[PDB]
């Protein structure tokens, strides 16, 4: 059941999205940084 499940996480501004990284215990991990993100949660909607 439920091959794909999709929930709405929130919304962003589509221009502040840029690649960055976080360093912690000198472990650089390349991340995607959404600067002005507004959280708007939703239920896990499921599809096939």
């Amino acid at each position: 059941l439920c091959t794909g499940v999709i929930q709405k996480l929130g919304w962003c501004l589509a221009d502040d999205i840029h690649t960055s990284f976080l360093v912690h215990k000198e472990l650089k991990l390349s991340v995607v940084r959404l600067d002005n993100f507004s959280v708007e949660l939703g239920d896990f909607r499921e599809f096939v």
Binding site: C2, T3, G4, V5, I6, Q7, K8, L9, G10, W11, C12, L13, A14, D15, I17, T19, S20, L22, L29, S30, V31, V32, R33, L34, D35, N36, F37, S38, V39, E40, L41, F44
Partner: protein
């Protein structure tokens, strides 16, 4: 921890706007031209192999 349920992300006195971080492997776009806005979705897709 102090999680944010609905709304923006900011410091006390709103002096710093926190940013949502996602690792590069989970990131996925399906268009080369993003709009003025784009929503974000969390996708779990199961491999029934």
């Amino acid at each position: 921890l102090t999680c944010v349920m609905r709304g923006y992300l900011y410091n006390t006195l709103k002096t710093e706007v926190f940013a949502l971080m996602i690792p590069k492997d989970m990131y996925l776009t399906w268009e080369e031209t993003r709009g003025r806005l784009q929503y974000v979705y969390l996708i779990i897709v199961y491999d029934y192999d």
